[PDB]
Amino acid sequence: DLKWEFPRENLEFGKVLGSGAFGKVMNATAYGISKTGVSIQVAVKMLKESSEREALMSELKMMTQLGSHENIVNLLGACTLSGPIYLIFEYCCYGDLLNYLRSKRLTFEDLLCFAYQVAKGMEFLEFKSCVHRDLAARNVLVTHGKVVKICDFGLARDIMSDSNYVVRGNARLPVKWMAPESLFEGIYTIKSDVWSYGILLWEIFSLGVNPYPGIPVDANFYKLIQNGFKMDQPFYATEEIYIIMQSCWAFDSRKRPSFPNLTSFLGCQL
Length: 270
Ligand SMILES: CC(C)(C)c1cc(NC(=O)Nc2ccc(-c3cn4c(n3)sc3cc(OCCN5CCOCC5)ccc34)cc2)no1
What we know:
- By secondary structure, the protein is an alpha+beta fold.
- The chain is built from eight helices and nine strands.
- Strands 1-2-3-5-4 form a five-stranded antiparallel beta sheet, with helices on one face. It has a two-stranded antiparallel sheet with strand order 6-7. A two-stranded antiparallel ribbon has the order 8-9.
- The N and C termini lie far apart (39 Å).
- It is found in: Membrane; Endoplasmic reticulum lumen.
- Residues 11-266 form the Protein kinase domain.
């Protein structure tokens, strides 16, 4: 974090766009930011009113080195001096993809376009050797165009409140989005996020349905995944797309396809 420091006085807060237990994300008007253009809309990541502060700091350290990508929420600046730590991001108008799709409850191409950009964005993370711990529809944002951006509501989401996060250790985790090796062996590779992508792929073509509908997370649930159980075809998906999901749902971690291949898989469908 060398040149990313932005004046806190040139920042004008607005309404809160989602608050966690210890942190919040708000809308803001930034003066003198891009071309020093008329003040634009930005997303500011912050903490609500100590040990947790360091968690946000490393998140900022990650952004500056990861570089800017079209399908990843871009870092525009930061405020680390004289006050609470601020993280200025690119503002997304339509919010998360999860709430955006149930709101729809737009063509089939747009569903493919979303998945393509997500897989293309994930490729950029694999190239940088980075593993997304919570890849889902609730962690991807949509902007003014047909483009989607990958993000992480760490400290931004009250994981205690969301039903998706179940207690299986000393912290909640998205069970229905995790790979088998992560479930019982706690192994997290980039091919584990491929599994998460498959689950993500489902809720995209199932329009924001919770995965494994009707069936809750219990002692029985873990046994199905261990038995190689996979989900049925979503309603708005075609046959070719479903084969990608079950490929991402291969029990053997090696068998799952690389995100590079996924970029090429969905791309050919234009
Ligand atoms: C993923 C990666 C790179 C590994 C990573 C992420 C990370 N850490 C993060 O990415 N943190 C993070 C958290 C939130 C945002 C964020 C949220 N929102 C925006 N950016 S824009 C926006 C707009 C919203 O809607 C407001 C009103 N709605 C508008 C549209 O209509 C309905 C209402 C709601 C939330 C929201 C960005 C980054 N650290 O590493």
